[PDB]
Structure formats: structure tokens, C-alpha cells
Write an enzyme that holds these catalytic residues in place. Structure first.
Site, PDB file in Angstrom:
ATOM      1  N   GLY A  39       0.792  -1.241   0.000  1.00 60.22           N
ATOM      2  CA  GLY A  39       0.000   0.000   0.000  1.00 60.22           C
ATOM      3  C   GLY A  39       0.819   1.282   0.000  1.00 60.22           C
ATOM      4  O   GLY A  39       0.177   2.338   0.236  1.00 60.22           O
ATOM      5  N   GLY A  40       2.139   1.235  -0.273  1.00 58.95           N
ATOM      6  CA  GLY A  40       2.977   2.450  -0.270  1.00 58.95           C
ATOM      7  C   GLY A  40       2.529   3.426  -1.364  1.00 58.95           C
ATOM      8  O   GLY A  40       1.879   3.023  -2.322  1.00 58.95           O
ATOM      9  N   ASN A  48       5.451  -3.773  -7.844  1.00 54.43           N
ATOM     10  CA  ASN A  48       5.555  -4.515  -6.557  1.00 54.43           C
ATOM     11  C   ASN A  48       6.130  -5.916  -6.777  1.00 54.43           C
ATOM     12  O   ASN A  48       6.887  -6.393  -5.911  1.00 54.43           O
ATOM     13  CB  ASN A  48       4.199  -4.657  -5.851  1.00 54.43           C
ATOM     14  CG  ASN A  48       4.217  -4.220  -4.398  1.00 54.43           C
ATOM     15  OD1 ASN A  48       3.968  -5.022  -3.490  1.00 54.43           O
ATOM     16  ND2 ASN A  48       4.477  -2.938  -4.181  1.00 54.43           N
ATOM     17  N   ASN A 107       1.038  -8.937   0.057  1.00 53.58           N
ATOM     18  CA  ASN A 107       2.133  -8.158   0.664  1.00 53.58           C
ATOM     19  C   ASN A 107       1.506  -6.976   1.423  1.00 53.58           C
ATOM     20  O   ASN A 107       0.729  -6.232   0.809  1.00 53.58           O
ATOM     21  CB  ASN A 107       3.080  -7.729  -0.460  1.00 53.58           C
ATOM     22  CG  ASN A 107       4.299  -7.004   0.041  1.00 53.58           C
ATOM     23  OD1 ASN A 107       4.896  -7.408   1.056  1.00 53.58           O
ATOM     24  ND2 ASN A 107       4.657  -5.931  -0.666  1.00 53.58           N
ATOM     25  N   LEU A 109      -0.625  -4.206   2.843  1.00 55.82           N
ATOM     26  CA  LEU A 109      -2.056  -3.920   2.564  1.00 55.82           C
ATOM     27  C   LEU A 109      -2.742  -5.084   1.843  1.00 55.82           C
ATOM     28  O   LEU A 109      -3.832  -5.454   2.234  1.00 55.82           O
ATOM     29  CB  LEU A 109      -2.159  -2.666   1.694  1.00 55.82           C
ATOM     30  CG  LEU A 109      -3.577  -2.199   1.382  1.00 55.82           C
ATOM     31  CD1 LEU A 109      -4.284  -1.781   2.652  1.00 55.82           C
ATOM     32  CD2 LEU A 109      -3.552  -1.062   0.364  1.00 55.82           C
ATOM     33  N   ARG A 186       8.571   6.347  -8.473  1.00 56.86           N
ATOM     34  CA  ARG A 186       7.488   6.229  -7.450  1.00 56.86           C
ATOM     35  C   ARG A 186       6.896   7.619  -7.199  1.00 56.86           C
ATOM     36  O   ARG A 186       5.643   7.720  -7.114  1.00 56.86           O
ATOM     37  CB  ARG A 186       7.997   5.559  -6.159  1.00 56.86           C
ATOM     38  CG  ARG A 186       8.288   4.064  -6.294  1.00 56.86           C
ATOM     39  CD  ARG A 186       7.038   3.206  -6.360  1.00 56.86           C
ATOM     40  NE  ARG A 186       6.298   3.413  -5.124  1.00 56.86           N
ATOM     41  CZ  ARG A 186       6.274   2.581  -4.080  1.00 56.86           C
ATOM     42  NH1 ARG A 186       6.897   1.416  -4.135  1.00 56.86           N
ATOM     43  NH2 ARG A 186       5.609   2.920  -2.986  1.00 56.86           N
ATOM     44  N   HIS A 263      10.700  -4.702   5.077  1.00 65.43           N
ATOM     45  CA  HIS A 263       9.259  -4.891   4.780  1.00 65.43           C
ATOM     46  C   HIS A 263       9.057  -5.477   3.368  1.00 65.43           C
ATOM     47  O   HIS A 263       8.122  -6.265   3.174  1.00 65.43           O
ATOM     48  CB  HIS A 263       8.572  -3.541   5.011  1.00 65.43           C
ATOM     49  CG  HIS A 263       7.109  -3.561   4.793  1.00 65.43           C
ATOM     50  ND1 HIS A 263       6.295  -4.382   5.537  1.00 65.43           N
ATOM     51  CD2 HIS A 263       6.314  -2.818   3.978  1.00 65.43           C
ATOM     52  CE1 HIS A 263       5.042  -4.169   5.176  1.00 65.43           C
ATOM     53  NE2 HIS A 263       5.027  -3.223   4.196  1.00 65.43           N
ATOM     54  N   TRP A 264       9.944  -5.186   2.434  1.00 66.89           N
ATOM     55  CA  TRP A 264       9.813  -5.645   1.024  1.00 66.89           C
ATOM     56  C   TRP A 264      10.500  -6.992   0.822  1.00 66.89           C
ATOM     57  O   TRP A 264      11.542  -7.025   0.102  1.00 66.89           O
ATOM     58  CB  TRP A 264      10.425  -4.636   0.067  1.00 66.89           C
ATOM     59  CG  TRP A 264       9.652  -3.382  -0.114  1.00 66.89           C
ATOM     60  CD1 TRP A 264       8.432  -3.041   0.395  1.00 66.89           C
ATOM     61  CD2 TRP A 264      10.085  -2.288  -0.932  1.00 66.89           C
ATOM     62  NE1 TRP A 264       8.090  -1.781  -0.033  1.00 66.89           N
ATOM     63  CE2 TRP A 264       9.080  -1.301  -0.856  1.00 66.89           C
ATOM     64  CE3 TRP A 264      11.229  -2.053  -1.705  1.00 66.89           C
ATOM     65  CZ2 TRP A 264       9.192  -0.093  -1.547  1.00 66.89           C
ATOM     66  CZ3 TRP A 264      11.339  -0.854  -2.381  1.00 66.89           C
ATOM     67  CH2 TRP A 264      10.329   0.107  -2.302  1.00 66.89           C
TER      68      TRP A 264
END
Ligand SMILES: [Cl-]
Ligand SMILES: [Cl-]
Ligand SMILES: [Cl-]
Ligand SMILES: [Cl-]
Ligand SMILES: [Cl-]
Ligand SMILES: [Cl-]
Lengths: 284, 284, 284, 284
Positions: A39-40, A48, A107, A109, A186, A263-264
Site C-alpha cells: 500500500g505504499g 511490486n 504483501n 495492505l 514512485r 518490509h519488502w
């Protein structure tokens, strides 16, 4: 395999017409798998899961769905609790495409969306793979908001290049994956007026009166399928202490933690992630 | 592959001659791997790793070593801190067989031995796979002794069939793996006078003045290799809260937890265990 | 203060008349506090709080209530989810005594009852002091059933003095608190046909289709009062890891852990517990 | 009681003369207690314990010591591992004042100093009260450096009022405690060349070849005294997960956690802290 070659659209009904963008690959492979991105700001299916779709499409029929408010799916100014809104959109797509019971990979969200879907439509969800998932995570030790959530809020209030870079740096253990090009790319997607609309409308839905549907750590004892939780030890968004309630309460849970990983997971441990997902979902 | 066909002996020097029994398979495979069994009464290499040696020997040159006091290795009435005694015996075997740097797979007691070896002889240990390991586990929440340790002590004081059965039942999630035959077989090996001698001599070495060498949670920040921790969620001997210090402090650690699995991961999740070990050690 | 001087009965309607026994002390004092005892075989208010009632009665108007199934309260053979059943009775007693909003102190089962009362009748519960409480505890690391719960179940199936003594010994850190006199007294009350009827009914009550009512860790985020959780580090019934969801999710939570203390905090650490409780409830 | 009425100096030898500033109060009282302040830029004894010294001085003979590098104690540019350096100075002061065995109260850095003193001079430390202590804390879930430590490092590199205010705001739950007056006063002391020299020296001191001296979670199993650990649930410098190894391994440990409380327990929960400390050290 390219953005353009894999790009697909469907129209589904969720309080009126809703355009869903997704990517399709590995057509004809026996086993369909649905991927749901994080959700970034500026996040979407293709960016993603770039180090994953090509590899997974060797074994599976992959549908990578842009969730409502992201990529090229509709970016409404208003919606209910986001994960239930996203799960309703996914149910629309499953019905349109004729899907029966399909495993989900989610992943952040998208892990919350996968879980809300598997709870509300239990016969339509197979095995789940959840990477640093939202919703079913409750940080028993980490004070909320976390460093990762705070940097996301700061970007939402002051959507500058510098604040996006500060957010992306707490997504990963190795800060060299945060290249000028990544930031530029991004920032370009994240700062469009309709993306900012979608990200603001997000804030009012996790914070609004619909919050209980977001607290999925309360409900995952109901999941009957195998569930593989995957965590970066150094996750600064949804830290490792968030895995514990889901690991304890999901009867057929498994947990895999990678050291030297933020997180990734699907980026920083892309190879080990692909292999774990392929084996867990049955090799295809 | 049989007990008899794989059976090997070596004499090494640890305060005088010490006979080591081990099993060898997959001779000629490029990559040697050493297996170290758990510490339950009557435990040994062949019975501990029966559902694993045949599969691992497809990919690796397997040496499954009976630790001192177990199986057909020497059963001395006296020794220092057990893991350092066992690691010194292993160093003797490595030197005798000409081994360089070799990955180690260690279950319970044998996981403590693998770690003590990797700390004391850092250039001789490669990747470690540790299943519900002793030594580097410190149960931050579970009161000590645990239910599993208490039932082991009770057997040591009253070495009856009924007390062995009660011990074996808290090794596994599915108590139907504890068959009359298993109990009969383990009781037969566990109740010989020299096995009882070896198990009593164990109690005085974890409880004696040499205890600090046993507290390997204090030292594993020094391990430089990848380490895969494997845990049964329902482990009643060395419960899951024991993984946390090692996961935090080993730089290249990974953790994998199986739901619906007790202390005997290599039995209850034999297939998933074999596959994780094969991939982690590089597929051979 | 004596058992007889303090003794009181009331009748309340809970799917029919229900006799409740309680002890009343400190009638002069302005601040009422309700005490709810732990749930082991033969437990009751006077004995459970024998090291506390006289000290608390100097500051507060104490109502120590024998929960349904215990002491001299009715022992029906049939009831729903126990904590909800006991909470309804207590609520009937609040209405009969003209109580508004009153603080509750609850050990173990009584802690579960206190929390269910505070969730179902939120305006009637003030500050909560909960010692090793059931219901809001979820053992994120300890495999269930715990050593303590297994010993309690063994007594239900085989209600012998030996099985009761074994249960009582895992209740406490200092096993010398389990004196022959205590075991003889608890066993004399626990072994009556009425008490065993209660004991079994309560068991059945926890695994119906109203099981959700027992999963109070899902609901205590809604508690608005200060809550003092108190735990023994060596609790083998409801171990320390069971405190984490409640400490995280109750906004005005506090936690006190005592080293060298098991499940009976109010006995094993009576003086420290008495002082924590007096200060937390405002000194009276 | 004033800063000036209570002020005292001593000179001790720690690889050469070392001036130590401290505050002395309650000279009538039999029980001495040593207070060691937290380690943020511009911290000192009088301000760190301004809500505590007057209350404690009614019961105890209070010695609140400015640690080397802080307040009016010497601020050398070079020293070894900080907690060992500060512990040696305190030991020199114990010898000069004729102290035997004295209880210590230590916040954060001061908690680290207290523990290193109690390990290196075991017969000289009585009961320990440690609030969000460094050194014995190891954050089993939180990625290091934490949000709090990163803000402290940013001030070392760029010592501005903005970077100091940002650090102070992650110290506390109630951000209104960080008043313009407090920020102006701490910043005036922190920004002096002598203080910044100290601040940087202390940094370098923690990552030498004596790093093991800072890993006090490896050693506190040897503490024989009662130890009261006190934590804020919302500590973002040394988070709550850092309490677990110490609570498990210190035989006579207790833990008190305060909800709605960050890293400055003695300020944010001053009244509850004062009462816990008075009772724990025996009421004086
Ligand atoms: Cl950063
Ligand atoms: Cl399945
Ligand atoms: Cl059993
Ligand atoms: Cl390697
Ligand atoms: Cl209140
Ligand atoms: Cl003492």
C-alpha cells in the site's frame, strides 16, 4: 513479459461500476494464483512483483490485481473499510473470470485484503502467503504508529520527493535498493492528483467508524487453510512482533523470518521468497 | 540403506580413546553434511533421522554421528559440559576423516552440540540447520523446567516403560506417532545399564560447575554463517519462545515455525523438513 | 473478622433463582470493591483471599463473592459459558445491593468473570485488578493446554487427593505453601458430588458454540478504565506470554510481574499484592 | 531543597583525576540510595529527577550523581566503554564517602551504569530500580537502531534545537511535557563544546573491541539482589521487548509496565514511580 503484454481490465460492481486493472501471465498453467500488492504511495501490481511475476508464471497462472485506489484501477475519493472494499472488488473479479477456490499471495495492505477475502468468502480462498501483512498483524511490543507508518503519514501531509525517499528507506534493510530512479519513478506515480485523492481517502477508512473490520488478528482463528506468514526480521512498518497472534491462532499456520530483510521481502529476498511460495502453493 | 550397511566406527582422542559410531550414505556426493541427533532416552542417529537420511543421501554425503553416551558411541560414567565434550569428539572425527568446513544439522541436544562446535572451531562449521535446539534456546516466557524436561527427569529417576511413554507423548503434536512398538523399542535401548549410566552422567554436567558453556544464547552473535532455526509451534520441550534471542542476535539467521508440530520436527513434518534442509544447504 | 461474622446470602434470577454466598467487611468504608476468587477445585472467597480480606477491609467495603459452582453458592449441573453465567449473577447482586460503578479484583477464573462483567455491563465496572486472569489471556508461545490446565483436567476425570495435590503444586512457585492441611481442606470441598457436578459443568461450558465469549483478548481494547494486570513469572496455568495482547490493547493498562511467583499471586506475594491493590484503587 | 543547597563535588582517580558533581539530600536518613540520570543531550541529576529527589529525600539519604560527560562532572574527550567508565567513577566515590552496599536507581544510560556497577562491584550494589535501562536491554523484536536512538544520532551529527526537540518528543508519551522552556534549557547545556565533545566520545565508546561490556543481558543472571525493572509501554528508545531477557534471567526480578508512558518514567509517571521505589527499597 511486459507491463503492456500482461495488462488486462475488468469492470465489476461495488456500489456502482469499478474498473479493475490486473496483469495476467502463465495462461494455461493448471493452478491460478492471485497476487495483491502493498500500500505504499505509487505502489501497483507490476512494480511490486517485478522480480516475482516472471518466475511464478513459470509454474502458475498469475493474476496480479491493482487494488482500488492503486495503479490503473479506479481511484474513488470515498469508500468503506479499505480491506472489505478491496475484497468486494476481488469477489467481483473472481465471479467475472469464473474462478473457484484460488490461493492468494498478499504483501502488506494486500495481505490484509487477502485475509478479509478469505474470511468473508471462505470457499473462494485457498492457501494464503502473507508477507509483512496488514490487518492480521498487531504489534504487541512496537508503539503505534511505527516509524514506517509515521513516514507514510508525513508523505500524505507533505507529498514531497524528500518525504517519499524517507518513507522508502524504512521499507528495506539495504538502503542502496532505494535508487534515485526508483524514487523518481514512485514520486511521479504517487504525486498525481487522483493518487493523492486515493491515499487521503485511505486515511479516513482505517481511522473511521469501520475500524473493527481492519482488526483481523481478532478473526484469523477461523481460517481453515494452510497460511504461510513471511517476515523480514528488520521490518520497520509492520514489525516481527505483529506475527505472533496470527501464528498462535491460525491452526495450519507456518512462519518464515528472513534476517537482513525489511518490509519488502519479495524484493530483498526475491529468490528465497519465490522458492518458498512455489513450494508452499504445491509447485504448480 | 540399512543400519548395518551404513554403520561405521572411528576412534578419536578426548581425555583418552573414545569410540564414535556413525552412519554414512551418499558417498561421492560433492557436499558432506553432518547430522547430530536429539538427547531423549535411547536416542541415536539411525532412529532419530530414519525418515531423513535416505532422502538427504540423494543430495549430500551424510555422516550421522552417535554423540558420546548414545547409540553405539562410548558411554562414559563422567565428562565435562556435554556439548563441549561432544564438540571435541566431533573435532576428532573431522580431523580423522579429513573434513574441512562442513554444514551441520542438529536436533535438540545435537543442535547445542552443532552450535558449540561452530563457536569453538569456527573455520570447520558451515551453514547450520537447528531443530528445537538446546543450548542457544532460552525460554523467555516458559517456566523452567518445561513439561518435556520434567518428564525426562522423572524417567531418569524411575526408568519405567510408563514414564518413557509419558516423556515420548510430549515430544509430538500427534500422540498417535507414539506406538507400542516405538515405546518397546526405545525402552529396550534406554534401560540398558550403560545407557542409564550415560543419562545419569548427563544430569551432573548441565547442573555442574561447567554450566556457562551450555548458555550459548550468550554467544551466537559470533556466528558468521547462515543459520536456519526450525521449530514446532507446539514444542513442549524447548518451546517457541526459546528461538527469540538466537533469531535476534545471529546476523544471517532465518526461522521457520511449523504449526501442528511438536519437538520432533524431522518426524512430524519430515517432508517439509527434508525440503527446507535440502534448499538451505544449497540443493547439494 | 471471621467466615461466620462476614457470611451473607442473596438470591438473584439467572434463568431461575440462584443462591449466592459472599463475605462483607469494612461496612464503614465509602469505596466498595468486589473480590472474585480463582477457579481450582474446592476454591472459595474466604480461603482464596485469606491473606488479603482483613488488610483490604481496613480501606474498602469488601464484597468477596463465591462464584456460581464454588463455596456456598448454588452448584447447578447446567449453565452456558461460565464467565458470562457468573457475570450475570454478579450483575443481579449489584442491582439487589444498589451498586453503581464498582472496582473489581479477580484471580484466574475470577479475573475472567471480572473482564466479562466489565465488557457486558461497562458502566458498572470501575478499575480492574486481574491476577493471572483467564479469558483475556492468550498464550502466544505456550502450547495449550498448559501443564496447569492438564493437571486440572486429570482431577476432573480422576478426582483423587493425589491428582488434587499435583494440581495445587503447579499453582505455586514455593511448593511448601501446599501443606497437608491445605490439600485436606480443598480436597474435602472439591470431592463432594455437588462440587464435582459444578467442576464438570464448567468444563463443558467453555467448548460450546458460545466459545467466542471466552476469547476476551478480542474485546478488551474496548475497556476504558485503568486495569492492573498482575502475574507470577512462574505461572504454569496461565503463563506470562498470556499477558501480552491485554497489555498492548487495553489503553490504560499496567502490568506488574513478580519473579519467584506462580498462579496464586494474592497468596505467594500477599503483602506486595495488598499494597499494589490499595494504591491502584485510590487508597480508600 | 535547591540545586545550590544540595550541590557537592568530589575528585576520584579514573586513569587520572576526575571531578564528579552530585546532589546530596536527606542527610538525617539511615538508608543511602544513589540516583543515576538518563543519557540524552543536556541531561543532569537535578533536572532528570526534579519530580523525585524531594519525595525520596524524605525517606532516604539521596546521592544523585552527574555521570561523567554530563552536568557539572568532567567531560573528557576520550574514555573506554561508557557504563564501565561511569561505574569506575561511582566506585571511586563510594570509597571516598565510605559506602558499603547501597541500592541504586538508574534511568536509561544511568540504568546501564547501575547494572555495570552491580556486575563489576557486586558487594557494593544493593537493590536496583532500573527505568527503561540501557545495557541489560536487548530489543528481541525492534530493529536497531530504534527511532529514539536514530534521533539521538541525528542530533550528534547536526546539533540544532530542531533535532534536540525531535529527540525529546520521542522520549515521552505526552508530547506536552516537551515545553519550549524545557527544550531551551536542555539545548543550552547540550550545545556547549564540552557537552558535544562528551556526547560524541560516548558514541565511539559503545562500538570498540570492549563492546561485550555493553551486552549486559549476557551477565544479569549473576545478579543476586531484588531488581525492579520499570518500563513505559510506549518507550520508543529502549522498547518493552528489551525487558524480556532481564526479567527471565534475574532470579529476584520484578517488572512494572505503565501504559501511556514513554522513556522518562520518573517524569511521566512520577507519583507511581516515587511510590514503587520507596516501597521496593524498604520504605526508609
Ligand atoms: Cl533512516
Ligand atoms: Cl490445501
Ligand atoms: Cl499428556
Ligand atoms: Cl554460506
Ligand atoms: Cl478511574
Ligand atoms: Cl535485599
Amino acid at each position: 513479459l511486459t507491463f503492456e503484454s500482461t495488462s488486462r481490465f475488468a469492470e465489476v460492481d461495488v456500489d456502482g461500476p469499478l474498473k479493475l486493472h490486473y496483469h495476467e501471465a502463465g495462461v494455461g498453467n493448471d493452478q491460478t494464483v492471485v497476487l495483491l500488492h502493498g500500500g505504499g504511495p505509487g505502489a501497483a501490481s507490476w512494480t511490486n512483483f517485478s522480480r516475482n511475476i516472471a518466475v511464478l508464471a513459470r509454474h502458475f497462472h498469475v493474476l496480479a490485481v491493482d487494488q482500488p485506489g492503486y495503479g490503473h484501477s479506479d481511484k474513488r475519493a470515498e469508500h468503506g473499510q479499505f480491506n472489505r472494499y478491496a475484497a468486494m472488488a476481488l469477489k467481483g473479479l473472481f465471479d467475472q473470470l469464473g474462478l473457484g477456490r484460488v490461493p492468494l499471495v498478499g504483501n502488506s495492505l494486500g495481505g490484509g485484503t487477502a485475509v478479509r477475502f478469505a474470511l468473508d468468502y471462505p470457499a473462494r480462498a485457498g492457501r494464503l502467503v502473507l508477507m509483512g501483512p496488514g490487518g492480521l498483524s498487531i504489534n504487541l511490543f512496537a508503539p503505534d504508529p511505527t516509524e514506517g507508518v509515521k513516514r507514510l503519514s508525513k508523505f500524505s501531509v507533505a507529498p514531497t520527493r524528500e518525504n517519499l525517499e524517507a518513507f522508502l528507506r524504512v521499507m528495506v534493510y539495504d538502503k542502496n535498493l532505494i535508487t534515485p530512479e526508483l524514487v523518481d519513478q514512485r514520486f511521479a506515480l504517487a504525486s498525481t492528483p487522483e493518487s493523492l485523492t486515493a491515499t487521503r481517502a485511505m486515511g479516513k477508512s482505517f481511522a473511521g467508524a469501520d475500524f473493527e473490520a481492519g482488526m483481523m488478528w481478532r478473526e484469523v482463528y477461523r481460517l481453515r487453510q494452510p497460511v504461510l506468514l513471511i517476515w523480514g526480521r528488520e521490518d520497520r512498518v509492520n514489525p516481527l512482533d505483529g506475527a505472533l497472534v496470527a501464528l498462535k491462532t491460525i491452526p495450519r499456520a507456518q512462519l518464515h523470518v528472513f534476517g537482513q530483510c525489511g518490509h519488502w521481502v519479495q524484493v530483498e529476498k526475491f529468490d528465497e521468497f519465490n522458492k518458498l511460495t512455489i513450494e508452499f502453493l504445491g509447485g504448480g
